[PDB]
Design a protein around this ligand. Structure first.
Ligand code: HEM
Ligand code: HEM
Ligand code: HEM
Ligand SMILES: O=C1NC(=O)c2c(NCc3ccccc3O)cccc21
Ligand SMILES: O=C1NC(=O)c2c(NCc3ccccc3O)cccc21
Ligand SMILES: O=C1NC(=O)c2c(NCc3ccccc3O)cccc21
Ligand SMILES: O=C1NC(=O)c2c(NCc3ccccc3O)cccc21
Ligand SMILES: O=C1NC(=O)c2c(NCc3ccccc3O)cccc21
Ligand SMILES: [Fe+2]
Lengths: 156, 156, 156, 156, 156, 156, 156
């Protein structure tokens, strides 16, 4: 079904953000596992899987709309050097992602691609849940202290 | 069965205390969940449910006695800004509630409404258990420190 | 995540309507149980519970958006004195509620808070189901007559 | 297998009657559900389903006989405005349907299409069962009164 | 609940499209079964049932909105004479349907009937999945050849 | 445990090849699904998953050896435009991957990193199995013909 | 089967390293248990058991190759006096063990004793996993502090 060219560009932009997040979250997960912070590693792994599933759905929608999904261009990963930075890098990436999602929904609405809009709204709900998680982790580091926060994430 | 006018007024005052407690505990629960302190959130949620069940029983007794349950007037909620204040706000509310329960029981006894007295005694037992929980949490904060106390309440 | 100030005001207004509905439906439920109309009592109880669930989700969203949920201000309860009037009071409240939901959705769309819109849309679907139920009950009273209508609601 | 031309015309006529009945019974069903008369709504829904199944077999038989099933022409639906009228409308349609079935059976018998006759006899048995049901409901309205009759069809 | 007159007209227009599709897909299904292409027949049958379910929900929504569902007017069925043409007829009908769904959604949005919009969006998702299925079948015919395509749809 | 610098460089090169393959195979999988060639789509999905698992193990080994896994640099994806070309693109990528694997094993052996060698040997076994599959598919296209080969991969 | 004299000497040297580790890890395990650090005790016990299993396989291989396993000469145990020292003593022993394993693998390769090489590679994989565990624990002590690290290892 021939899609709107600019819808497809927006979907490829969202997909590109998901592709960054897959790799960024997967590396952060394995860094935390390597450091013995296995509960953080496990949760970050599941965040990475979630982005993989979003990327899948975007690829499928783009192809149905007779566009070419862009898996070639990989933007800049934000890799932290400690737990606090890794969580902040994730949150900064999510805030860009949700900004881009909102602009994509605007355009979908304007050209009446309501199914693409519904897909993006669902992805936006997942990303806002991830923002909730990240903001809460940063708040907990303040409320329980870094040593306790890391201690609470050693064992699964 | 027509009840004593002043019993019904006492029952409505106790009900009013329960209605404040429902909302105060429900908001505190959701604040704690938002902050990532999910074990505190779950326990405060169950305290809110407790008060909902007491309010139900009070409403049922008032109606049986052919009075009008007052769900319209809501007294002042005591909302804290941090964990220790939220617990102390709960405790201050509970101490007012048990004072009001005692005066209501005196009057039920004087006019021989022994069934209303028994209901209020059951509610008073529950409220004294809540006071025990609150005093104990405040004592634990002193013994283990706030950061450890909150750490122990991150995960359900 | 910092929310739009007027979105949060709209959410608190929707929350206020739900808080009214919780108490109005809970009291109507217990009135119907006291009168021996237990099927009405049980159905109205479940309506109250549904409103409690909506209020929970609104509270949770407001906190995520870094607003202050308002559980203190309680608007006017519409309490009926007989079955037809109670249903009509519920219906009047619901029509006020869906008017407010539509205006809140308009504003969420305008500021691109698509997740808040989706939450409100889900709530609007529930409230329109309640309107469907209420309009149908009032119509049944006209079709089968009040005495038969009440008879049919004595037993669950 | 090449069928008799007039058998196919008769089969298309019976099918045309079933297609009217499908839509008339389905709309009456949903009207009754909208009005809270859910036992009538459910029963009328099953009548519509039964006509769908008859239409299926008629379509299958026409095609085996190398005819063209006519799903394009839709005759006049008889939609009532209240329960008595709706039941009488169904009954008027069923009486036309059974007249047409009898004439189709005569013709199948004359050209020795005994399998088509057997199919139509089975459909006629179902339509006479529907007639019994309809006549009985109209009779019950007279015996128990309209208000009781409707009351008895509120709950499934 | 009194709905917008033009929303109801749009809903009846969508319903009219579903009613055409029910009959067109059902006949196509039974043609394919008669020709021994049972996997096509079964899939097309399930497409017809899906349109029946959409029509039900549209009828129910119209009645809730106090309009009159139109099951009387049946538009033009597009019946093919061979497998390729039947698939193209279905696809042509689906493209008209999704064009009409988009216009109805625009109008629901403008009058703030967000629940009708959500229903139509769900139907639109279903119809776009049908378009994907249809476009894919036509493409497979080109890739594997017509004889192989039919061969693969002989047995379920 | 501090690893050999050039081993880590080799591991990152193997990792880089796996990251290309993940995306290349995932996109090919979703293209085949879009085209209705669901058995190829499923098999190619499992190949993509297999490469994801290899990438995970390389990332973990690199971090253990105190290197920085490179998920940022993504080399050139080889995306075909039809089935035969997609298989060949997978095959060309795999032939480069196994050459690089052999060179990495040589160097691991030279510096006595026998665990890294064993990991690379296991990955090489998986890549050679993938080569067996790909060569066999390309040969089957020749033996049964393209139209039959595609037909045989339509349904899972 | 007569083995290479120097392979057997290498195998007896690896065996000697394993025998030290059995006793060192078993004593550390029981010290931690006596101190109430039962999770460290349990983990260290399983490390000791693992070395016992390695020693068993080495003894079996030496006898198959017609050498004499040396269980008489026991090298120097590295027993720490506190948790940090005990972990570092384990790590120092493992680093010596993996150096000796690498030299033995070199010699097995030169004389084509590929089965002995495979046995040693498997032991080396297990010892590098122990190195990973030990390095991670020492890092966790720095990240969460010694008191939290010990607290997390009180209960199994
Ligand atoms: C007049 C005030 C209220 C009364 C009388 C009341 C009564 C009740 C009762 C009797 C239950 C069932 C508990 C059980 O036996 O399991 C319940 C459940 C619940 N209430 Fe309330 N309640 C009130 C207010 C509220 C408010 C203000 C909120 C939230 C803001 C709330 C949230 C809930 C929730 C989330 C549940 C659990 C529902 C479920 O999933 O089953 N309630 N309430
Ligand atoms: C040419 C007209 C039609 C034919 C031949 C037809 C045929 C059928 C058949 C064979 C079934 C399944 C019966 C079974 O379960 O054994 C069915 C189910 C159904 N039909 Fe129809 N039908 C037609 C029109 C309609 C229309 C116009 C509507 C609604 C407005 C409708 C609504 C339904 C529904 C809701 C179901 C149940 C699907 C489910 O299982 O959930 N049908 N139909
Ligand atoms: C550095 C890149 C990636 C790595 C390391 C990686 C790793 C993984 C791993 C370890 C799994 C679990 C496999 C198992 O079941 O054991 C997985 C699953 C999966 N991956 Fe990835 N992956 C990557 C990229 C991607 C991309 C780019 C996509 C799609 C665009 C994707 C889609 C999926 C899906 C759909 C699943 C299964 C999810 C489910 O359980 O439903 N992955 N990945
Ligand atoms: O990242 C990428 N996403 C893609 O589609 C893609 C490529 N596609 C080649 C191609 C072109 C025109 C039509 C069909 C096609 O398969 C080629 C390279 C990279 C990518
Ligand atoms: O309601 C209907 N039933 C049908 O068959 C039909 C149509 N069929 C076209 C056609 C003609 C001649 C031969 C094979 C054919 O498919 C066309 C329109 C409507 C209908
Ligand atoms: O397809 C149809 N949908 C309908 O409602 C309908 C008819 N309705 C009769 C009627 C009119 C005015 C007011 C209430 C009513 O029941 C009559 C014929 C056909 C249809
Ligand atoms: O693809 C990547 N793999 C990585 O490690 C990485 C980055 N690492 C930052 C960094 C440097 C020095 C020390 C610790 C560190 O976390 C930064 C960007 C991209 C990548
Ligand atoms: O630690 C030890 N390992 C051994 O084999 C061993 C002894 N072996 C006695 C013996 C000698 C000559 C030939 C065959 C034999 O069994 C004796 C003492 C200690 C050990
Ligand atoms: Fe602690």
């Amino acid at each position: 079904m021939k899609g709107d060219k600019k819808v497809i560009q927006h979907l490829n932009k969202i997909l590109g953000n998901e592709l960054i997040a897959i790799n960024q979250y997967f590396l952060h997960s394995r860094m935390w596992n390597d450091w013995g912070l296995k509960r953080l590693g496990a949760h970050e792994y599941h965040e990475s899987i979630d982005e993989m599933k979003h990327a899948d759905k975007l690829i499928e929608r783009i192809l149905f709309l007779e566009g070419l999904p862009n898996l070639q261009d990989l933007g800049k990963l934000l890799i932290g050097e400690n737990t606090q930075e890794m969580l902040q890098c994730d949150l900064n990436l999510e805030l860009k992602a949700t900004k881009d999602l909102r602009e994509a929904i605007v355009h979908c609405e304007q050209v009446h691609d309501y199914v693409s809009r519904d897909l993006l709204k669902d992805i936006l709900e997942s990303e806002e849940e991830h923002i909730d998680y990240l903001e809460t982790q940063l708040g907990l580091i303040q409320k329980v202290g870094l040593e306790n926060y890391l201690q609470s994430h050693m064992h699964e």
